[PDB]
């Protein structure tokens, strides 16, 4: 369950 | 502990690794080379795009996120073709292909 929120 | 011991590969430690780069980094510190609780680059690289393809990593309509996932896992051809389809990033995908060429 890896996140899809890019480091911003 | 399991970054030092490369254990509990299934547990994504989502409490601390909430970003995508934190996941990649969490796993590349867990990959192994030559049977239980063990992950290798081949499994990880295939496991990522086969099960969680573009669809999973492009729902936020952010293309580079998926590209970084493929490129930082040595899957350069996938990342090149993928990024070559974005009509706004054709230029960039051709050249990253030339460099690899």
Answer yes or no: do B60 and A4 touch at CB < 8 A.
yes
A3 contacts in B (CB within 8 Å)? 14, 17-20, 22-23
Q: How far apart are CA B57 and CA B46, in angstroms?
A: 15
For this PDB entry, the determination method is cryo-EM
- CA distances B24 to B16, B41, B70, Å, are 13, 11, 10
B17 contacts in A (CB within 8 Å)? 3
Token code pair at residue B100: 């690899």
Enter the resolution in angstroms. 37.0
B14 contacts in A (CB within 8 Å)? 1, 3
- CA distances B93 to B58, B76, B86, B89, B96, Å, are 17, 10, 9, 6, 5
């Amino acid at each position: 369950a890896p996140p899809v929120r890019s480091i911003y | 502990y399991c970054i030092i011991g490369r254990c509990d590969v299934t547990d994504n430690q989502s409490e601390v690794a909430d970003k995508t780069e934190d996941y990649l980094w969490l796993k590349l510190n867990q990959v192994c080379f030559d049977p239980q609780d063990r992950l290798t680059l081949s499994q990880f690289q295939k496991q990522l795009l086969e099960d969680y393809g573009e669809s999973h990593f492009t729902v936020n309509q952010q293309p580079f996120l998926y590209f970084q996932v493929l490129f930082l896992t040595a899957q350069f051809e996938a990342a090149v073709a993928f990024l070559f389809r974005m009509e706004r990033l054709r230029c960039h995908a051709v050249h990253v292909a030339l460099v690899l060429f």
